[PDB]
């Protein structure tokens, strides 16, 4: 049936709307479950590594595994408690961790392919083509795009060069990556990281395991890190119908010190990401998470210490909460880097009807 | 035959035809020669063309937007499956027919889009452009107590060339330093220019002054206006505040010379960003919004 | 290495079919190279390639199909089409291709193995194979089947020949435990030997007997080898001994 009820910690007194709370350790369930939608809402819920790029990818995979296992029943047809189980899976994901603006797109999809198919077919014939439709999809509106921006980028860059950065975005990464490797550039980057997710610290690594030159810092320490360096760049999650920059947590104070120190920004985004939705603020539906992500004493995530904190439902008259998606200024952010090349975020819906 | 030759061929005259027009006559007869019944013989070739064009610029931009237009045109024309004669005849046609089209849309410019000088709104005009000075030469006839503002143009003194044109008009006009640009922001209604291109961020690709410009109209609110002919859309991306594909060096920091040599090779070309824009004079309607950005979308269908 | 035309004529015709393997692609056309009629490299237009999302189909490595429009035969210059070619047409366009290839696996191994140019022995193989009989590949398998296209002209190389027969010509593991207790054995197990390569023998232990059986198309082994097997039970049951099979 489920559960709920038991939340952790003061519930404070502003931003209060969205889901935050719960099944961290499972007791109890309906009996016709798939296990495999559950392991991932799991993952995605205690993960330090997934920013916006590979979520939907992960999700279609785990889409595609389904219909791979998809037995149709020897009485009802292929989609009759299909549906019910479908809603089951998209409550449950919800529980753990909000769908995004990509998987929402990815479950609009789903639904015109149920349509496409309508009820009429045996197993083996049609799930064999949707497969392969679905992958052929995949390889279209995704990687293919994203090389597409990859070689935007590499054009981008003329002579010399020193950058900062920041954010988990998988393009980004294989962007420098490709900098570093096969264009042989004079690439220097800087890295910076936040609290609530270690991203910078993964693309350290990352840089590490090809052997970059690189500075390390952090939101804070920014004003001596100017004193020759030009450019900078961010990863964005998704736009909405007003071209304002719907992302991640640390990007918008970083915008507008560029803005201030004289040479501007640039961000990268994908055809598909998108929406109709509309908002012009963080308060309306943002990515609240447990206070747990402001427990540990810097350096590094497991080294538990009994220092000075280490409570909050005892502490009488105190608010701790931390916010992880944004909407950053608009005019801020010059270039954006599409499928259509370059363009001005200005466009905002320009795809969006063109569907 | 060249393309080259046919725009050495004007120069002392000029002063009427829109260059990307002329451009893409030239264009239009280097093909009709050679047969442009086939695609693989041809359009490989203009390509090349194209190329060598570019290679051989001096210091000319819009050269590169004409031919892409002129692509795009070329692309659309064979999407109606009938024949190859016809539609290739079709295509003949509209090189000149282009040509004839500018003029009308100079006229179009210069009687519907000119109220924007009428209440003795004095005028801040740099950047000279033929669209910008046929309006006023065309407002002169009516009489609406119009004044000019020059900022002084020193690529090589085309300010003078310019105070020569308004003085066929007989309408007073002063000299302006653009050093005291801070100065005279005050009498002065609105800073209108002419330029080179529009890009795909939005702002505007131009000449020797432009940037400190646009600040300064930022500054003090009185709005900042772009007035053309409408094709230069050319596919480029000035994503910084200090570049652009450059025909010059980029701030050349010159060695310890001596008896005062290399000194003059002050940035003849600047950009400022795309919320500068208070309005767009173009042909194909007053749109500027995002105009330029939405018609590039439409060329490349993205 | 792979160069030169598969067909009797260098450029194509007016009409006549091809197939393309896309590189890279939105400026003009295509200019990219082919898998039917020659490697060398001919154009396409982006006009005749949108017929009913256009950017994100074709792009890199993709099969398509393609029709010769305009043929510049003097010094090259082919003009392409995807539009004009119809969806019946496109199935044997597919099959020609198909075929197109396999030919050209049949002549790869030869030119690699005798170190020899493959545009020598295209020559050799495509006159009495490719005018006469209709397509190589089916002549190949009617030589193969019997031997009546090969014939036409005298062989310069017997090796090459040799080793593709063999390449056209599966082996499928099989263990007998033989564990005899008997009188007379040895003349049982030459009587066994005597009727099951009527295949590949091998002997490394002595009770263990190691057989690889041919197999046709695959499928085909499950028939042979337990045939084997029961003649291997029908061998020692009259003598006085046992054999054991996994």
């Given at each position: 049936?489920?559960?709920?009820?038991?939340?952790?910690?003061?519930?404070?007194?502003?931003?209060?709307?969205?889901?935050?709370?719960?099944?961290?350790?499972?007791?109890?369930?309906?009996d016709l479950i798939h296990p495999s939608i559950l392991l991932l809402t799991s993952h995605l819920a205690h993960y330090k590594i997934v920013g916006s790029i590979p979520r939907c990818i992960a999700?279609?995979?785990?889409?595609?595994?389904?219909?791979?296992?998809?037995?149709?029943?020897?009485?009802?047809?292929?989609?009759?408690?299909?549906?019910?189980?479908?809603?089951?899976?998209?409550?449950?994901?919800?529980?753990?961790?909000?769908?995004?603006?990509?998987?929402?797109?990815?479950?609009?999809?789903?639904?015109?392919?149920?349509?496409?198919?309508?009820?009429?077919?045996?197993?083996?014939?049609?799930?064999?083509?949707?497969?392969?439709?679905?992958?052929?999809?995949?390889?279209?509106?995704?990687?293919?795009?994203?090389?597409?921006?990859?070689?935007?980028?590499?054009?981008?860059?003329?002579?010399?060069?020193?950058?900062?950065?920041?954010?988990?975005?998988?393009?980004?990464?294989?962007?420098?990556?490709?900098?570093?490797?096969?264009?042989?550039?004079?690439?220097?980057?800087?890295?910076?990281?936040?609290?609530?997710?270690?991203?910078?610290?993964?693309?350290?690594?990352?840089?590490?395991?090809?052997?970059?030159?690189?500075?390390?810092?952090?939101?804070?320490?920014?004003?001596?890190?100017?004193?020759?360096?030009?450019?900078?760049?961010?990863?964005?999650?998704?736009?909405?119908?007003?071209?304002?920059?719907?992302?991640?947590?640390?990007?918008?104070?970083?915008?507008?010190?560029?803005?201030?120190?004289?040479?501007?920004?640039?961000?990268?985004?994908?055809?598909?990401?998108?929406?109709?939705?509309?908002?012009?603020?963080?308060?309306?539906?943002?990515?609240?998470?447990?206070?747990?992500?402001?427990?540990?004493?810097?350096?590094?995530?497991?080294?538990?210490?009994?220092?000075?904190?280490?409570?909050?439902?005892?502490?009488?008259?105190?608010?701790?909460?931390?916010?992880?998606?944004?909407?950053?200024?608009?005019?801020?952010?010059?270039?954006?880097?599409?499928?259509?090349?370059?363009?001005?975020?200005?466009?905002?819906?320009?795809?969006?009807?063109?569907? | 035959?060249?393309?080259?030759?046919?725009?050495?061929?004007?120069?002392?005259?000029?002063?009427?035809?829109?260059?990307?027009?002329?451009?893409?006559?030239?264009?239009?007869?280097?093909?009709?020669?050679?047969?442009?019944?086939?695609?693989?013989?041809?359009?490989?070739?203009?390509?090349?063309?194209?190329?060598?064009?570019?290679?051989?610029?001096?210091?000319?931009?819009?050269?590169?937007?004409?031919?892409?237009?002129?692509?795009?045109?070329?692309?659309?024309?064979?999407?109606l499956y009938g024949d190859w004669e016809n539609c290739k005849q079709h295509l003949i046609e509209n090189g000149q027919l282009f040509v004839s089209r500018a003029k009308k849309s100079r006229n179009?410019?210069?009687?519907?889009?000119?109220?924007?000088?009428?209440?003795?709104?004095?005028?801040?005009?740099?950047?000279?452009?033929?669209?910008?000075?046929?309006?006023?030469?065309?407002?002169?006839?009516?009489?609406?107590?119009?004044?000019?503002?020059?900022?002084?143009?020193?690529?090589?003194?085309?300010?003078?060339?310019?105070?020569?044109?308004?003085?066929?008009?007989?309408?007073?006009?002063?000299?302006?330093?653009?050093?005291?640009?801070?100065?005279?922001?005050?009498?002065?209604?609105?800073?209108?220019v002419g330029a080179e291109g529009v890009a795909e961020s939005g702002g505007i690709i131009n000449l020797v002054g432009t940037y400190s410009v646009g600040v300064l109209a930022h500054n003090a609110?009185?709005?900042?206006?772009?007035?053309?002919?409408?094709?230069?859309?050319?596919?480029?991306?000035?994503?910084?505040?200090?570049?652009?594909?450059?025909?010059?060096?980029?701030?050349?920091?010159?060695?310890?010379?001596?008896?005062?040599?290399?000194?003059?090779?002050?940035?003849?070309?600047?950009?400022?960003?795309?919320?500068?824009?208070?309005?767009?004079?173009?042909?194909?309607?007053?749109?500027?919004?995002?105009?330029?950005?939405?018609?590039?979308?439409?060329?490349?269908?993205? | 290495?792979?160069?030169?035309?598969?067909?009797?004529?260098?450029?194509?015709?007016?009409?006549?079919?091809?197939?393309?393997?896309?590189?890279?692609?939105?400026?003009?056309?295509?200019?990219?190279?082919?898998?039917?009629?020659?490697?060398?490299?001919?154009?396409?237009?982006?006009?005749?390639?949108?017929?009913?999302?256009?950017?994100?189909?074709?792009?890199?490595?993709?099969?398509?199909?393609?029709?010769?429009?305009?043929?510049?035969?003097?010094?090259?210059?082919?003009?392409?089409?995807?539009?004009?070619?119809?969806?019946?047409?496109?199935?044997?366009?597919?099959?020609?291709?198909?075929?197109?290839?396999?030919?050209?696996?049949?002549?790869?191994?030869?030119?690699?193995?005798?170190?020899?140019?493959?545009?020598?022995?295209?020559?050799?193989?495509?006159?009495?194979?490719?005018?006469?009989?209709?397509?190589?590949?089916?002549?190949?398998?009617?030589?193969?089947?019997?031997?009546?296209?090969?014939?036409?002209?005298?062989?310069?190389?017997?090796?090459?020949?040799?080793?593709?027969?063999?390449?056209?010509?599966?082996?499928?593991?099989?263990?007998?435990?033989?564990?005899?207790?008997?009188?007379?054995?040895?003349?049982?197990?030459?009587?066994?030997?005597?009727?099951?390569?009527?295949?590949?023998?091998?002997?490394?232990?002595?009770?263990?007997?190691?057989?690889?059986?041919?197999?046709?198309?695959?499928?085909?082994?499950?028939?042979?080898?337990?045939?084997?097997?029961?003649?291997?039970?029908?061998?020692?049951?009259?003598?006085?001994?046992?054999?054991?099979?996994?």
């Amino acid at each position: 049936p489920g559960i709920s009820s038991v939340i952790p910690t003061v519930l404070e007194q502003s931003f209060d709307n969205s889901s935050l709370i719960s099944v961290k350790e499972l007791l109890l369930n309906k009996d016709l479950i798939h296990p495999s939608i559950l392991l991932l809402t799991s993952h995605l819920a205690h993960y330090k590594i997934v920013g916006s790029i590979p979520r939907c990818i992960a999700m279609l995979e785990v889409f595609q595994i389904v219909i791979k296992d998809y037995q149709t029943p020897k009485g009802t047809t292929l989609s009759r408690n299909l549906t019910s189980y479908l809603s089951h899976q998209i409550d449950l994901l919800k529980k753990a961790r909000p769908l995004s603006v990509t998987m929402g797109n990815a479950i609009r999809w789903l639904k015109q392919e149920i349509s496409l198919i309508d009820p009429s077919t045996p197993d083996k014939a049609a799930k064999k083509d949707l497969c392969e439709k679905i992958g052929q999809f995949a390889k279209e509106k995704i990687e293919l795009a994203d090389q597409l921006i990859i070689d935007n980028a590499s054009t981008q860059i003329e002579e010399s060069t020193t950058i900062v950065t920041y954010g988990s975005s998988k393009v980004l990464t294989e962007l420098l990556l490709h900098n570093a490797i096969s264009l042989k550039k004079n690439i220097k980057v800087i890295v910076v990281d936040s609290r609530p997710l270690f991203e910078g610290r993964k693309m350290a690594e990352t840089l590490r395991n090809a052997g970059v030159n690189v500075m390390y810092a952090l939101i804070t320490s920014l004003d001596t890190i100017f004193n020759d360096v030009d450019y900078v760049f961010l990863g964005a999650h998704s736009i909405l119908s007003n071209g304002f920059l719907y992302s991640r947590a640390g990007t918008a104070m970083l915008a507008m010190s560029a803005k201030r120190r004289n040479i501007p920004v640039l961000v990268c985004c994908e055809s598909l990401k998108f929406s109709q939705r509309v908002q012009l603020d963080s308060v309306t539906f943002n990515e609240l998470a447990d206070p747990n992500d402001l427990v540990n004493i810097d350096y590094e995530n497991p080294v538990e210490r009994r220092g000075n904190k280490g409570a909050l439902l005892n502490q009488f008259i105190k608010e701790r909460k931390f916010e992880k998606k944004k909407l950053a200024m608009e005019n801020k952010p010059k270039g954006n880097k599409i499928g259509g090349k370059k363009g001005s975020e200005g466009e905002s819906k320009d795809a969006s009807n063109e569907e | 035959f060249n393309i080259t030759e046919t725009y050495l061929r004007f120069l002392e005259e000029d002063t009427e035809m829109t260059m990307p027009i002329a451009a893409i006559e030239a264009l239009v007869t280097l093909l009709r020669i050679k047969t442009p019944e086939t695609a693989a013989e041809m359009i490989n070739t203009i390509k090349s063309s194209t190329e060598e064009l570019i290679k051989s610029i001096p210091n000319s931009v819009s050269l590169r937007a004409g031919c892409d237009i002129f692509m795009r045109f070329v692309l659309r024309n064979l999407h109606l499956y009938g024949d190859w004669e016809n539609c290739k005849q079709h295509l003949i046609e509209n090189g000149q027919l282009f040509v004839s089209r500018a003029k009308k849309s100079r006229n179009k410019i210069a009687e519907i889009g000119v109220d924007f000088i009428a209440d003795d709104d004095i005028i801040l005009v740099h950047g000279y452009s033929r669209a910008v000075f046929s309006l006023l030469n065309h407002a002169a006839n009516k009489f609406i107590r119009f004044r000019c503002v020059v900022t002084e143009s020193r690529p090589s003194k085309q300010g003078n060339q310019l105070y020569t044109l308004l003085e066929q008009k007989g309408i007073p006009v002063t000299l302006i330093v653009d050093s005291a640009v801070g100065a005279v922001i005050d009498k002065v209604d609105k800073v209108f220019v002419g330029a080179e291109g529009v890009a795909e961020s939005g702002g505007i690709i131009n000449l020797v002054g432009t940037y400190s410009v646009g600040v300064l109209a930022h500054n003090a609110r009185k709005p900042f206006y772009v007035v053309t002919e409408s094709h230069k859309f050319v596919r480029m991306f000035p994503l910084s505040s200090d570049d652009l594909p450059m025909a010059g060096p980029p701030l050349d920091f010159t060695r310890r010379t001596d008896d005062l040599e290399d000194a003059l090779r002050g940035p003849t070309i600047d950009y400022t960003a795309q919320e500068y824009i208070t309005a767009l004079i173009t042909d194909l309607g007053v749109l500027t919004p995002s105009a330029v950005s939405e018609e590039l979308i439409k060329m490349w269908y993205d | 290495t792979s160069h030169c035309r598969f067909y009797e004529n260098k450029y194509p015709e007016i009409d006549d079919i091809v197939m393309v393997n896309v590189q890279q692609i939105a400026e003009m056309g295509a200019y990219v190279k082919l898998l039917e009629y020659d490697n060398i490299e001919g154009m396409i237009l982006l006009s005749e390639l949108s017929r009913r999302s256009i950017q994100k189909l074709i792009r890199v490595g993709k099969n398509d199909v393609a029709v010769v429009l305009r043929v510049d035969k003097e010094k090259g210059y082919i003009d392409l089409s995807k539009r004009r070619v119809s969806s019946e047409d496109i199935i044997k366009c597919e099959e020609k291709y198909q075929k197109s290839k396999t030919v050209h696996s049949i002549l790869r191994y030869c030119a690699e193995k005798f170190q020899i140019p493959l545009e020598e022995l295209y020559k050799t193989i495509a006159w009495p194979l490719s005018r006469k009989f209709g397509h190589a590949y089916e002549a190949f398998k009617l030589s193969i089947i019997d031997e009546t296209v090969w014939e036409g002209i005298e062989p310069p190389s017997k090796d090459v020949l040799d080793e593709l027969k063999n390449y056209i010509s599966v082996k499928i593991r099989a263990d007998v435990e033989v564990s005899c207790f008997s009188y007379e054995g040895i003349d049982a197990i030459k009587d066994a030997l005597k009727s099951a390569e009527d295949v590949k023998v091998k002997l490394v232990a002595a009770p263990l007997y190691v057989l690889t059986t041919q197999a046709l198309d695959k499928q085909k082994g499950i028939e042979q080898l337990e045939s084997a097997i029961e003649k291997i039970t029908e061998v020692i049951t009259k003598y006085g001994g046992v054999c054991n099979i996994t």
